[PDB]
PDB file of C-alpha atoms in Angstrom:
ATOM      1  CA  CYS A   1     -15.754  -0.944  -4.243  1.00 25.43           C
ATOM      2  CA  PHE A   2     -12.527   0.967  -3.486  1.00 28.26           C
ATOM      3  CA  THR A   3     -11.769   4.693  -3.413  1.00 29.65           C
ATOM      4  CA  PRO A   4     -10.276   6.205  -6.602  1.00 27.22           C
ATOM      5  CA  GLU A   5      -7.034   7.246  -4.897  1.00 29.08           C
ATOM      6  CA  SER A   6      -6.256   3.658  -3.826  1.00 30.67           C
ATOM      7  CA  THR A   7      -3.142   2.107  -5.352  1.00 30.38           C
ATOM      8  CA  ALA A   8      -2.814  -0.818  -7.760  1.00 32.25           C
ATOM      9  CA  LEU A   9       0.563  -2.405  -8.457  1.00 33.51           C
ATOM     10  CA  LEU A  10       1.149  -2.984 -12.166  1.00 31.53           C
ATOM     11  CA  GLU A  11       3.278  -5.724 -13.669  1.00 34.24           C
ATOM     12  CA  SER A  12       6.289  -3.620 -14.743  1.00 35.16           C
ATOM     13  CA  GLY A  13       6.673  -1.925 -11.320  1.00 36.48           C
ATOM     14  CA  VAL A  14       4.216   0.884 -12.073  1.00 38.30           C
ATOM     15  CA  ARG A  15       1.714   2.076  -9.494  1.00 40.39           C
ATOM     16  CA  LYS A  16      -1.581   3.581 -10.598  1.00 38.44           C
ATOM     17  CA  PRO A  17      -4.560   4.924  -8.653  1.00 39.22           C
ATOM     18  CA  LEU A  18      -7.760   2.994  -9.247  1.00 39.72           C
ATOM     19  CA  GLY A  19      -9.369   6.138 -10.672  1.00 44.60           C
ATOM     20  CA  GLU A  20      -6.814   6.130 -13.508  1.00 47.26           C
ATOM     21  CA  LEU A  21      -6.339   2.359 -13.893  1.00 45.42           C
ATOM     22  CA  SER A  22      -7.294   1.280 -17.427  1.00 47.12           C
ATOM     23  CA  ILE A  23      -8.591  -1.888 -19.000  1.00 48.76           C
ATOM     24  CA  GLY A  24      -5.638  -3.831 -20.349  1.00 51.80           C
ATOM     25  CA  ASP A  25      -3.396  -3.011 -17.389  1.00 50.97           C
ATOM     26  CA  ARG A  26      -2.052  -6.046 -15.525  1.00 52.99           C
ATOM     27  CA  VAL A  27      -2.160  -5.676 -11.742  1.00 54.36           C
ATOM     28  CA  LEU A  28      -1.057  -7.645  -8.707  1.00 53.59           C
ATOM     29  CA  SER A  29      -3.722 -10.127  -7.564  1.00 53.82           C
ATOM     30  CA  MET A  30      -3.885 -13.101  -5.172  1.00 53.58           C
ATOM     31  CA  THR A  31      -4.881 -16.616  -6.186  1.00 53.77           C
ATOM     32  CA  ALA A  32      -7.287 -18.716  -4.147  1.00 54.06           C
ATOM     33  CA  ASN A  33      -4.274 -20.445  -2.564  1.00 54.60           C
ATOM     34  CA  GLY A  34      -2.600 -17.157  -1.624  1.00 53.62           C
ATOM     35  CA  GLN A  35       0.002 -16.738  -4.374  1.00 53.19           C
ATOM     36  CA  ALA A  36       0.752 -13.349  -5.913  1.00 57.19           C
ATOM     37  CA  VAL A  37       0.234 -13.129  -9.686  1.00 56.31           C
ATOM     38  CA  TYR A  38      -0.316 -10.439 -12.297  1.00 59.35           C
ATOM     39  CA  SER A  39      -3.763 -10.383 -13.838  1.00 56.86           C
ATOM     40  CA  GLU A  40      -5.232  -8.183 -16.573  1.00 57.92           C
ATOM     41  CA  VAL A  41      -7.953  -5.674 -15.703  1.00 60.47           C
ATOM     42  CA  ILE A  42     -10.645  -6.605 -18.200  1.00 61.20           C
ATOM     43  CA  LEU A  43     -13.660  -4.456 -17.196  1.00 61.96           C
ATOM     44  CA  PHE A  44     -15.019  -2.302 -14.392  1.00 60.51           C
ATOM     45  CA  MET A  45     -18.042  -3.624 -12.550  1.00 59.08           C
ATOM     46  CA  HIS A  46     -18.492  -0.098 -11.208  1.00 59.20           C
ATOM     47  CA  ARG A  47     -16.686   3.142 -11.926  1.00 58.70           C
ATOM     48  CA  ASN A  48     -18.253   6.381 -10.686  1.00 59.19           C
ATOM     49  CA  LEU A  49     -15.780   9.042  -9.564  1.00 60.15           C
ATOM     50  CA  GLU A  50     -18.565  11.355  -8.329  1.00 61.57           C
ATOM     51  CA  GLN A  51     -20.544   8.917  -6.142  1.00 60.90           C
ATOM     52  CA  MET A  52     -20.403   9.677  -2.411  1.00 60.22           C
ATOM     53  CA  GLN A  53     -20.008   6.575  -0.317  1.00 61.68           C
ATOM     54  CA  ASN A  54     -19.460   5.350   3.230  1.00 61.40           C
ATOM     55  CA  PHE A  55     -16.337   3.186   3.483  1.00 60.85           C
ATOM     56  CA  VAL A  56     -14.767   0.938   6.091  1.00 60.63           C
ATOM     57  CA  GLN A  57     -11.078   1.748   6.618  1.00 59.31           C
ATOM     58  CA  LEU A  58      -8.819  -1.106   7.750  1.00 63.24           C
ATOM     59  CA  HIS A  59      -5.374  -0.215   9.086  1.00 65.58           C
ATOM     60  CA  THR A  60      -2.846  -3.035   9.411  1.00 68.29           C
ATOM     61  CA  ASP A  61       0.034  -3.420  11.856  1.00 69.57           C
ATOM     62  CA  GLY A  62       2.505  -2.975   8.985  1.00 67.90           C
ATOM     63  CA  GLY A  63       1.093   0.278   7.607  1.00 66.96           C
ATOM     64  CA  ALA A  64      -1.314  -0.754   4.865  1.00 66.21           C
ATOM     65  CA  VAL A  65      -4.643   1.082   4.793  1.00 67.76           C
ATOM     66  CA  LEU A  66      -7.549  -0.400   2.812  1.00 66.73           C
ATOM     67  CA  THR A  67     -10.652   1.754   2.234  1.00 65.40           C
ATOM     68  CA  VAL A  68     -13.529  -0.358   0.902  1.00 65.66           C
ATOM     69  CA  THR A  69     -17.316  -0.413   0.952  1.00 65.62           C
ATOM     70  CA  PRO A  70     -19.004  -2.425   3.734  1.00 65.96           C
ATOM     71  CA  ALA A  71     -19.899  -5.423   1.560  1.00 66.94           C
ATOM     72  CA  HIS A  72     -16.557  -5.612  -0.200  1.00 64.45           C
ATOM     73  CA  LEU A  73     -14.989  -9.074   0.096  1.00 62.25           C
ATOM     74  CA  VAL A  74     -11.581  -8.929   1.823  1.00 64.84           C
ATOM     75  CA  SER A  75      -9.160 -11.828   2.192  1.00 64.65           C
ATOM     76  CA  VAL A  76      -8.779 -13.085   5.762  1.00 65.58           C
ATOM     77  CA  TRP A  77      -6.332 -15.635   7.168  1.00 64.58           C
ATOM     78  CA  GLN A  78      -7.688 -17.964   9.841  1.00 62.46           C
ATOM     79  CA  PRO A  79      -4.621 -19.236  11.759  1.00 65.58           C
ATOM     80  CA  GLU A  80      -6.518 -21.705  13.942  1.00 66.72           C
ATOM     81  CA  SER A  81      -7.696 -23.573  10.837  1.00 67.95           C
ATOM     82  CA  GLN A  82      -4.817 -22.265   8.664  1.00 64.39           C
ATOM     83  CA  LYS A  83      -7.199 -21.331   5.862  1.00 60.76           C
ATOM     84  CA  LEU A  84      -7.796 -18.332   3.601  1.00 58.39           C
ATOM     85  CA  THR A  85     -11.334 -17.054   3.253  1.00 59.57           C
ATOM     86  CA  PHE A  86     -13.240 -13.911   2.298  1.00 59.95           C
ATOM     87  CA  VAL A  87     -15.070 -11.741   4.841  1.00 60.41           C
ATOM     88  CA  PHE A  88     -17.172  -8.631   4.280  1.00 57.22           C
ATOM     89  CA  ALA A  89     -15.173  -5.528   5.160  1.00 56.71           C
ATOM     90  CA  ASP A  90     -17.838  -4.432   7.671  1.00 56.34           C
ATOM     91  CA  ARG A  91     -17.439  -7.710   9.589  1.00 54.95           C
ATOM     92  CA  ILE A  92     -13.675  -7.430  10.046  1.00 55.72           C
ATOM     93  CA  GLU A  93     -12.493  -6.665  13.573  1.00 53.03           C
ATOM     94  CA  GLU A  94      -9.250  -5.611  15.214  1.00 49.74           C
ATOM     95  CA  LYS A  95      -6.798  -8.537  15.518  1.00 48.76           C
ATOM     96  CA  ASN A  96      -8.314 -10.292  12.504  1.00 49.69           C
ATOM     97  CA  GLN A  97      -5.552 -11.063  10.004  1.00 48.23           C
ATOM     98  CA  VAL A  98      -5.659  -9.758   6.435  1.00 49.49           C
ATOM     99  CA  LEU A  99      -3.126 -10.560   3.705  1.00 46.65           C
ATOM    100  CA  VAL A 100      -0.588  -7.827   2.965  1.00 44.80           C
ATOM    101  CA  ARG A 101       2.214  -7.641   0.408  1.00 43.10           C
ATOM    102  CA  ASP A 102       5.659  -7.792   2.012  1.00 40.57           C
ATOM    103  CA  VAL A 103       8.102  -5.437   0.272  1.00 41.53           C
ATOM    104  CA  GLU A 104      10.898  -7.786   1.322  1.00 41.47           C
ATOM    105  CA  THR A 105       9.615 -10.817  -0.622  1.00 40.54           C
ATOM    106  CA  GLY A 106       6.575  -9.849  -2.685  1.00 42.01           C
ATOM    107  CA  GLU A 107       4.533 -12.499  -0.876  1.00 40.97           C
ATOM    108  CA  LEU A 108       1.077 -11.869   0.595  1.00 39.27           C
ATOM    109  CA  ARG A 109       1.427 -12.624   4.294  1.00 36.63           C
ATOM    110  CA  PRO A 110      -0.929 -12.289   7.272  1.00 35.69           C
ATOM    111  CA  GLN A 111      -0.990  -9.016   9.214  1.00 38.06           C
ATOM    112  CA  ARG A 112      -3.243  -7.988  12.078  1.00 38.15           C
ATOM    113  CA  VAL A 113      -5.834  -5.265  11.667  1.00 35.70           C
ATOM    114  CA  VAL A 114      -4.966  -2.609  14.240  1.00 38.43           C
ATOM    115  CA  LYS A 115      -7.721  -0.095  13.520  1.00 40.52           C
ATOM    116  CA  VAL A 116     -11.220  -0.224  12.037  1.00 39.61           C
ATOM    117  CA  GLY A 117     -12.444   3.214  11.053  1.00 40.76           C
ATOM    118  CA  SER A 118     -14.930   4.695   8.637  1.00 41.24           C
ATOM    119  CA  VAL A 119     -15.010   7.598   6.217  1.00 39.16           C
ATOM    120  CA  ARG A 120     -17.443   9.157   3.766  1.00 42.96           C
ATOM    121  CA  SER A 121     -15.659  10.120   0.582  1.00 43.44           C
ATOM    122  CA  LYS A 122     -16.292  10.691  -3.094  1.00 43.88           C
ATOM    123  CA  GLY A 123     -15.806   8.083  -5.786  1.00 41.65           C
ATOM    124  CA  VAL A 124     -16.186   4.312  -6.117  1.00 43.11           C
ATOM    125  CA  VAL A 125     -14.188   1.971  -8.369  1.00 42.37           C
ATOM    126  CA  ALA A 126     -14.445  -1.817  -8.858  1.00 45.11           C
ATOM    127  CA  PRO A 127     -11.990  -3.137 -11.479  1.00 44.12           C
ATOM    128  CA  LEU A 128     -12.349  -6.794 -12.413  1.00 41.85           C
ATOM    129  CA  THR A 129      -9.209  -8.821 -13.138  1.00 43.00           C
ATOM    130  CA  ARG A 130      -9.036 -12.198 -14.856  1.00 42.14           C
ATOM    131  CA  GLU A 131      -8.138 -13.669 -11.455  1.00 41.49           C
ATOM    132  CA  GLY A 132     -11.165 -12.082  -9.761  1.00 41.49           C
ATOM    133  CA  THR A 133      -9.002 -10.566  -7.002  1.00 41.00           C
ATOM    134  CA  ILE A 134      -6.791  -7.484  -6.707  1.00 41.02           C
ATOM    135  CA  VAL A 135      -4.152  -6.232  -4.271  1.00 41.47           C
ATOM    136  CA  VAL A 136      -5.054  -2.641  -3.335  1.00 43.41           C
ATOM    137  CA  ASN A 137      -2.874  -0.478  -1.074  1.00 45.23           C
ATOM    138  CA  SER A 138      -0.866  -3.698  -0.542  1.00 46.77           C
ATOM    139  CA  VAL A 139      -3.921  -5.552   0.868  1.00 50.15           C
ATOM    140  CA  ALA A 140      -5.393  -8.593  -0.892  1.00 53.85           C
ATOM    141  CA  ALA A 141      -9.096  -8.233  -1.711  1.00 55.33           C
ATOM    142  CA  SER A 142     -11.684  -9.664  -4.026  1.00 58.61           C
ATOM    143  CA  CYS A 143     -12.680  -7.549  -6.993  1.00 55.53           C
ATOM    144  CA  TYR A 144     -16.256  -8.103  -5.797  1.00 59.41           C
ATOM    145  CA  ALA A 145     -18.471  -6.363  -3.345  1.00 57.43           C
ATOM    146  CA  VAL A 146     -21.551  -8.467  -2.959  1.00 53.91           C
TER     147      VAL A 146
END
């Protein structure tokens, strides 16, 4: 799950916080091969704005900050094997590479994690897109926490 203040990018340039994102909205998502696409939000697997929760906070070298629950699946680039995979947020370490939207090109490109923090805050949201993934605060993630 994500925090409700986290940002989705909608198809017509709109930004919406996850706590106000609605079914039917089309949001930026990443395909299994790493391409950016728009995908409709079709349901919420979880949506509780009052639920207190411990979150991992991943800060990237380019200034994206992803706040997700420990078992949330986050996209990771492995440069030695040149392969995209998913890793639990709680397993991600500094210097691991996540996939971040470049404002210059709109592509999702690898960026190093520069800080791993934690926070306890209120509200959890898990929108599901048709693609099964979502770009949140410019960082590519699964829709799923395990």
